[PDB]
Design a protein around this ligand. Structure first.
Ligand code: GTP
Lengths: 334, 923
RNA sequence: GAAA
DNA sequence: ATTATGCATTTCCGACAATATCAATAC
DNA sequence: GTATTGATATAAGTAAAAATGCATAAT
């Protein structure tokens, strides 16, 4: 009952700002079946969904035709994309707003100021049953926005004050590889540590078979991602894209100290711990040598460590009496 | 034993000369003590403090800095000794390769011989002093940068060896890699040794915990997704280093002299008696040093010597009254005038809840960063004032001298960097002349005009200025009687300390009945208005420029900045017809300060963002808008650029000619130098920099090049540094953007030096701040005459034409690059010759081969044998056929062109002599 | 901070 | 062949301005 | 095997893209 934009229509658009979009209804059906959101959300007719950077809107139209949610909203401020969305989706229950998803004040002015989109707050013992958010951040310069949203998962402030809001995001292949790297892998970084600490992420689909070697073979076997060619994404000059599902989880550490410890430890990501604690302050090496009795810990590199080991280290850092000030970690540039 | 009071008390000229001779004989040992070097002075001071502490029982915290430094030196010297022994053992054999650890010994084989030359205690003290000097530098909150510290320590060790070698002389340079390795090795050894004692509180016990912690630690930080190796200093050391014993801990090495400076007779002789200083300040350039040595050999720089000697021969002393007022203000503790105010530690607003708005969290982080930056800036600005006041205390009531140097352009600066008369208003008000000359019949008028100028009313006629000064007599009296605990009228001036000194002198004059016979020491300033624009007008013969920069005599002094501000306000009134709100907000908000900076900088080649920042910096205090006023500043820049483009024409013409000449020089290749193969293809190296000479014979070489930043493996880390000891292609944009300002500044410096030399010949006391010249109040008329005559003599010739002739002579045989389409018959001939010459050579002849053939053909005509010359003329090369053509500049393949410079713009017929009576040329 |  | 594209007036005072890890090559 | 120059990632609001300040060079 909702029109689905076609390849000829979406091909008339001039600028996509580096964002690749998908237009194949068959692979949309495949990925929706793989996700199996019908069981997670017991009342799809009572489901409120927020869409960020929709672009073509084909995914939103197929989502509506498949589930019939209680409310769906598209946030798109780019000129031609919004114009095409209004032209193709007017006269339908889908709603399009001329707002830019990057601004932090946009969500406040949309939720508690203008009183348009209000999610349902529930307990943290289960995934948010009446709130779903969908995003498409494929622009290669917009990885900072993804990391900011992960930090917002950590702080429970941006959209996670509502609960365990399930995330569905299209990201570039490199970003997914970096976020889904296991201990010991060459691509593991602080983004991987944040992903392991805050979320539970799965690779629902990818756009290139040759890029799967960046992921762990065991994780690939468990996930069973859906693969499709690059001919199904309209702007064909871009790198392959991937789809992930992020489920926020519970944690029992302090975010500021953990962030400081991980950031200053993973700078030297191939150096054993018996020579990197000197970078955490004055006397750090002797203090941590005295306070740590484990054997392989003093020889493991921080790329070999995991979230539990990092939490142990940050708890020791808290217990340090002579610890440095976390706040005074910046430069006097401007 | 005060000497200035005795000198003033002596009533006879012969007795004054006798006392001056006695003082000069007596001050030699004091000069030797002052010029005693840093390593020896620091070592003796630290050992003395340690001995005194050992004598007085056990007192640690009182002299903690010096006691700790001596302890560290004593317990860290053996590490350096053992490393030197290890290096000797690993170099004495000199037999095996791939010996030891790959990272360890291959580095030692590199930095070994550079460590065995200098004394181990000497490197110890050098490292300690450098690391104490470079604190809170580079944006690091409480420490230095590793890249900075390794170079500074290594460079200091290199410099101390040069002094030791030359001292024994009564080896060229060290590589940057070696400097970095030495610095890293020694800083690591100091880190391993430096221990401080601090007490903290246990989080779970809430009681004090005792222990010893390293003083220095090596860590990394981030700024916009990029690493930053840093070195930190513990708070227990910061609190003492930023204290009032910093002068005792780090003794200065370039202080004002007590005896008359050694005259300049050679490019490496002059200034201090025991310290060797080069005439020029060459940051990193061997070409400038080579050209300076060649000029010194030729002997074409002697007026430069005369001017610098006149500048350095003037005696100074410390103003006791202003010093006492400054000391009272400083000891009070409250922030007064521009002294910020002594605060101990930071104050931070309470953090919001963690689950608050991300915008709120970002705002809080921004506020914290701003507060920390302000606190650090205030602490630095207070430490600088403390250092200057301690030097003033040291040299109180004593004769002073300030030997001068030059920078690569030619402008003159004192050798002493800490306390001199180029500082801020406090430093300029803390210094007076040693010789006190009678005021005569004009000193009163000139001193009153000086005070009126120091109150910012330096755009009024002289009658108005003296009327202002004589109307404010009661305020002058009150300010000079009780500066503090009074009406504080002198603080309203834009130069408060100088106004205070002038008020002291004026009251001391007014207390008598015969002001003519008063003895004054206060220097009086006379500076030109829009000096760069004046020089541009003189260069271009611009009658309009001359009449608007006060060159043409007039009753009232003009102000180009006020004129431009008024014109732009009229333009905004015009735009009020459209009445856009952005224009309406700033229509009447124009200020002559903003217009002044923009108009001054425009003739030097300023860009849109530069003008935007210049306008915004001075528009912030007006607070017309938020920090997003950059839109308002950009509109301001647009219309002020339109106005200045309308106004200034001949100056921009000369600027364009200079820029075009710089481009032609930067895109040129030498014949003999670049005849060798480069194996880069059709892209020959550009090794030519814009060089010219001042009318005084000083050669100026532009040092702009391209910097290659590569990581160097040091002990602490791998620093990201460049090599300024290697030849690199010249930065064309830098040369083109630097020539127009450098030429004008060189002209300014030459005129200042001419005036200084003539005033020295005429027996006056001369001091200068670039475009501003100081002297006694009674010698101002003679000084004005000297300046006018020197300016007329300097600009009597066509300086731009002489520069063009010099460029043509120095670039006789040079090759440019040009692309012309083969559609033209002439341009296709070059392509045919290139094909024909390739077949003749038997291979694919390149641009390098063609240039080499042209250079070799020229050598034939330059050969003494006519037969070779006849063959050379008979032989036609690629560039030879293009010598006659001078119109193909605008008429595809790249072809070689000769170096021809643009024609000089027409110069208006303006007689520069007419300024010999212009009252407001300098004021 | 100082000068164009 | 117009598209990207680095840079934004000069000088001096300590007056600045990234480092680690890896991935094929070269020897 | 050891040794070497180049490519790539880091953090994460003072966006990136598109549309400009602007000249110079380029993929
Ligand atoms: O007022 C200045 C000054 O006290 C100090 N400061 C900043 N840079 C320097 C410097 O190179 N040398 C010295 N001796 N002192 C310095 O910090 C204060 C803050 O200066 P701002 O950043 O506000 O202004 P800046 O000098 O950068 O202005 P400009 O020269 O770019 O116009």
């Amino acid at each position: 009952s909702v029109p689905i934009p076609g390849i000829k229509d979406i091909s008339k658009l001039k600028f996509f700002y580096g964002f690749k979009y998908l237009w194949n209804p068959t692979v949309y059906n495949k990925i929706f079946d793989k996700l199996d959101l019908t069981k997670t959300y017991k009342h799809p007719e009572e489901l409120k969904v927020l869409d960020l950077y929709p672009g073509v809107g084909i995914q939103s139209a197929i989502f509506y035709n498949k589930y019939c949610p209680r409310q769906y909203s598209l946030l798109e401020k780019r000129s031609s994309l919004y114009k095409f969305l209004n032209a193709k989706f007017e006269g339908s229950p889908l709603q399009i707003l001329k707002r830019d998803p990057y601004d932090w004040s946009t969500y406040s002015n949309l939720i508690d100021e203008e009183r348009i989109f209000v999610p349902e707050v529930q307990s943290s013992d289960h995934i948010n049953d009446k709130f779903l958010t969908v995003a498409n951040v494929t622009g290669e310069g917009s990885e900072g926005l993804i990391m900011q949203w992960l930090s917002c998962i950590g702080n429970k402030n941006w959209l996670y004050r509502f609960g365990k809001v399930k995330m569905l995001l299209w990201m570039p292949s490199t970003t997914a590889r970096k976020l889904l790297a296991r201990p010991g892998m060459h691509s593991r970084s602080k983004c991987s540590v944040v992903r392991e600490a805050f979320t539970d992420t799965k690779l629902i689909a990818i756009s290139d078979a040759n890029e799967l070697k960046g992921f762990d073979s065991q994780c690939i076997e468990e996930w069973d991602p859906i693969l499709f060619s690059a001919a199904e994404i309209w702007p064909t000059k871009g790198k392959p894209i991937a789809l992930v599902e992020m489920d926020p989880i519970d944690f029992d550490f302090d975010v500021d100290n953990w962030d400081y410890v991980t950031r200053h430890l993973m700078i030297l990501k191939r150096t054993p711990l018996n020579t990197v604690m000197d970078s955490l302050g004055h006397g750090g090496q002797q203090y941590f040598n005295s306070r740590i009795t484990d054997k392989d810990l003093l020889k493991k590199c921080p790329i070999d460590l995991t979230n539990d080991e990092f939490i142990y280290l940050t708890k020791l850092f808290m217990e340090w009496p002579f610890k440095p000030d976390i706040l005074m970690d910046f430069v006097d540039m401007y | 034993i005060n000497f200035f009071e005795i000198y003033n008390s002596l009533p006879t000229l012969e007795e004054k000369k006798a006392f001056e001779s006695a003082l000069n004989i007596f001050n030699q040992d004091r000069q030797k003590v002052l010029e005693n070097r840093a390593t020896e002075a620091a070592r003796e001071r630290w050992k003395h403090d340690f001995e005194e502490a050992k004598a007085r029982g056990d007192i640690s915290i009182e002299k903690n800095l010096n006691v700790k430094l001596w302890k560290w030196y004593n317990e860290m010297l053996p590490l350096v000794k053992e490393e030197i022994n290890h290096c000797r053992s690993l170099l004495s054999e000199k037999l095996s390769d791939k010996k030891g650890l790959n990272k360890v010994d291959t580095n030692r084989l590199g930095y070994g011989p550079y460590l065995t030359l200098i004394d181990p205690g000497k490197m110890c003290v050098i490292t300690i002093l450098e690391l104490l000097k470079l604190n809170s530098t580079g944006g690091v909150i409480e420490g230095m940068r590793t890249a900075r510290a390794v170079i500074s320590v290594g460079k200091a060790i290199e410099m101390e060896f040069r002094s030791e070698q030359v001292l024994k002389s009564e080896k060229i340079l060290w590589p940057q890699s070696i400097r970095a390795r030495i610095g890293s090795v020694l800083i690591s050894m100091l880190i391993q040794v430096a221990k401080v004692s601090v007490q903290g509180v246990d989080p779970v016990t809430k009681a004090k915990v005792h222990g010893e912690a390293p003083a220095f630690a090596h860590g990394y930080q981030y700024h916009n997704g990029s690493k930053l190796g840093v070195l930190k200093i513990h708070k227990t050391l910061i609190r003492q280093l930023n204290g009032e014993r910093l002068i005792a801990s780090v003794q200065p090495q370039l202080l004002p002299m007590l005896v008359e400076p050694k005259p300049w007779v050679n490019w490496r002789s002059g200034g201090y008696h025991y310290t060797q200083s080069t005439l020029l300040r060459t940051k990193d350039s061997p070409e400038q040093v080579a050209y300076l040595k060649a000029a010194s050999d030729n002997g074409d720089i002697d007026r430069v010597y005369d001017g610098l000697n006149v500048l350095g021969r003037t005696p100074w002393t410390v103003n006791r009254k202003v010093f006492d007022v400054v000391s009272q203000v400083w000891n009070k503790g409250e922030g007064f005038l521009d002294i910020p105010g002594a605060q101990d530690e930071m104050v931070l607003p309470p953090a919001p809840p963690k689950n608050s708005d991300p915008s709120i969290l970002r705002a809080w982080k921004l506020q914290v960063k701003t507060i920390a930056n302000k606190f650090s800036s205030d602490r630095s600005n207070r430490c600088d004032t403390n250092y200057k006041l301690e030097i003033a205390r040291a040299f109180l009531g004593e004769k002073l001298y300030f030997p001068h140097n030059l920078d690569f352009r030619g402008r003159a600066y004192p050798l002493s960097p800490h306390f001199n008369h180029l500082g801020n208003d406090m430093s300029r008000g803390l210094l007076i002349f040693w010789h006190g000359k009678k005021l005569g019949p004009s000193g009163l008028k000139w001193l009153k005009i000086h005070l009126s100028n120091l109150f910012g009313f330096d755009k009024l006629p002289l009658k108005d200025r003296v009327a202002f000064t004589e109307s404010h007599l009661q305020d002058i009296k009150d300010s000079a009687e009780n500066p503090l605990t009074g009406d504080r009228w002198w603080t309203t001036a834009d130069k408060p300390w100088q106004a205070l000194a002038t008020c002291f002198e004026l009251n001391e004059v007014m207390k008598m009945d015969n002001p003519e016979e008063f003895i004054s020491h206060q220097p009086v300033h006379q500076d030109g208005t829009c000096n760069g624009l004046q020089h541009y007008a003189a260069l271009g013969g611009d009658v309009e420029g001359a009449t608007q920069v006060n060159l043409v005599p007039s009753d009232k002094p003009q102000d180009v900045y006020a004129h431009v501000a008024r014109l732009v306000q009229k333009r905004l009134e015009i735009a009020a017809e459209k009445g856009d709100e952005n224009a309406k907000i700033l229509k009447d908000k124009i200020t002559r300060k903003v217009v002044k900076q923009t108009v001054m900088t425009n003739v030097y080649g300023v860009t849109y963002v530069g003008a935007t920042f210049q306008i915004a910096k001075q528009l912030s205090p007006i607070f017309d808008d938020r920090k997003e006023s950059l839109d308002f500043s950009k509109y301001l820049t647009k219309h002020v650029f339109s106005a200045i483009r309308e106004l200034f024409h001949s100056a921009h013409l000369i600027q364009d000619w200079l820029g075009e000449s710089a481009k032609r020089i930067s895109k040129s290749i030498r014949l003999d130098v670049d005849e060798k193969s480069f194996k880069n293809g059709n892209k020959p190296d550009f090794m030519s920099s814009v060089i010219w000479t001042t009318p005084l014979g000083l050669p100026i070489v532009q040092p702009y090049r391209e910097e290659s930043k590569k990581q160097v493996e040091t002990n602490l880390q791998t620093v990201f540094i460049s090599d300024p000891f290697a030849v690199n292609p010249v930065n064309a944009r830098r040369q083109k953007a630097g020539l127009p300002p450098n030429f004008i500044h060189s002209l300014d410096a030459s005129h200042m030096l001419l005036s200084a030399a003539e005033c020295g010949k005429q027996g006056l006391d001369f001091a200068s701040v670039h475009d501003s010249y100081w002297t006694h109040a009674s010698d101002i008329d003679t000084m004005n005459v000297v300046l006018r005559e020197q300016f007329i003599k300097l600009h009597e010739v066509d300086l731009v034409l002489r520069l063009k002739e010099e460029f043509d002579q120095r670039y006789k045989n040079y090759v440019k690059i040009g692309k012309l389409k083969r559609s033209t018959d002439l341009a296709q001939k070059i392509i045919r010759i290139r094909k024909d010459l390739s077949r003749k050579l038997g291979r694919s002849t390149t641009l390098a081969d063609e240039i080499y053939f042209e250079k070799k053909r020229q050598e034939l005509l330059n050969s003494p044998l006519i037969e070779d010359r006849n063959v050379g003329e008979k032989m036609v090369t690629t560039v030879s056929l293009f010598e006659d053509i001078t119109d193909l500049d605008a008429l595809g393949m790249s072809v070689l062109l000769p170096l021809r410079l643009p024609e000089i713009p027409p110069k208006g017929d303006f007689d520069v002599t007419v300024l010999r009576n212009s009252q407001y040329f300098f004021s």
